[PDB]
């Protein structure tokens, strides 16, 4: 696990350089945005269950075949597992928001996600769609809430979209 601070340390440690003007400015940018990052994390901690359920309800209306037969969200067992997965992605994005780094998103989520989903027969397309629906649900709620910075919210979910999804082009 690595945050924005640890990533910058590791970058300068590799070269064996002291923290320069560019290094101090990037840290100062993190510390000024940090107050907004905790406040964004306080928002999603409040509405953890409500967002997951509503984003799923939007997903199964977009792609109805999931909750239909031969779908991988048909049964209660599958429905509970999918909402659990939707809970996972929101929880690890929650960690990624404060960290301001997608290393936590890589290490513990994305690293062996494709291998697992290909094994059980879990779709990878509707998954990243469900993550993107969650993103739009956070951003709209963050726009509604008194938050100055909301641009950093898109970052972890887009990284979740970029890494997991198949390379079309």
């Amino acid at each position: 696990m690595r945050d924005a601070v640890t990533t910058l340390i590791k970058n300068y440690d590799l070269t064996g350089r002291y923290l320069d003007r560019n290094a101090m400015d990037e840290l100062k940018a993190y510390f000024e945005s940090g107050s907004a990052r905790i406040a964004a994390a306080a928002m999603i901690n409040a509405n953890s269950a409500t967002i997951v359920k509503r984003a799923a309800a939007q997903l199964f209306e977009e792609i109805p075949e999931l909750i239909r037969p031969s779908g991988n969200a048909y049964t209660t067992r599958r429905f509970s597992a999918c909402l659990r997965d939707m809970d996972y992605y929101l929880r690890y994005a929650s960690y990624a928001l404060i960290a301001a780094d997608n290393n936590v998103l890589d290490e513990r989520v994305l690293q062996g996600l494709r291998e697992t989903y290909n094994s059980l027969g879990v779709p990878i397309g509707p998954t990243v769609r469900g993550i993107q629906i969650m993103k739009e649900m956070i951003e709209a709620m963050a726009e509604d809430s008194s938050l100055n910075s909301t641009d950093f919210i898109a970052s972890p979910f887009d990284h979740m979209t970029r890494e997991l999804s198949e390379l079309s082009v």
């Binding site: 696990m1 690595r2 945050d3 601070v5 640890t6 340390i9 300068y12 440690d13 064996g16 002291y18 923290l19 320069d20 101090m24 840290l27 100062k28 993190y30 510390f31 940090g34 107050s35 905790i38 994390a41 306080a42 901690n45 953890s48 929880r91 690890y92 929650s94 960690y95 404060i98 960290a99 936590v104 513990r108």
Partner: protein, 160 residues
């Protein structure tokens, strides 16, 4: 990092971030400006700290500098000053991160095995960082000195 420690603790229980952790990150964020002040003074005076505490080491412990010692010779003395420059850089990473995790992972895990292989007394390296603590403390304010010393003292404990 403190942020690293807070998330990892939260993830292990799988419960999101607790209000107790969120308060500690908030304390880290607010104290980040003070952390950058201490780091800037350490990175700014990196040439002076190593030179002063290095000279302090060679006066207090002349045995390492004396023939038969580990740091005897122009090249070996330069390597010792390079080592002190490495540990001061590790301190600046620590101050910035808030904790002593970067100091651990890079240059504290297996120092005893390293300096045994080189034939360096570990108590003498413990002296050099302790002298680096005293020089750095006598450049910044009392609150800044007490904050920085906590990172230095952790190195001392891992050394000896």
């Amino acid at each position: 990092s403190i942020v690293t420690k807070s998330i990892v603790n939260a993830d292990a229980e799988a419960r999101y971030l607790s209000p107790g952790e969120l308060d500690r990150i908030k304390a880290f964020v607010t104290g980040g400006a003070a952390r950058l002040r201490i780091a800037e003074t350490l990175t700014g005076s990196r040439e002076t700290i190593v030179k002063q505490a290095g000279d302090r080491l060679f006066q207090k412990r002349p045995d390492i500098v004396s023939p038969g010692g580990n740091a005897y010779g122009e090249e070996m003395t330069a390597t010792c000053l390079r080592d002190m420059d490495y540990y001061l850089r590790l301190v600046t990473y620590g101050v910035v991160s808030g904790d002593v995790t970067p100091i651990e992972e890079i240059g504290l895990v297996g120092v005893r095995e390293m300096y045994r292989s080189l034939g360096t007394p570990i108590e003498a390296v413990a002296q050099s960082v302790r002298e680096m603590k005293e020089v750095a403390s006598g450049l910044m304010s009392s609150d800044d000195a007490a904050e920085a010393s906590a990172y230095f003292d952790f190195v001392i404990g891992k050394m000896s």
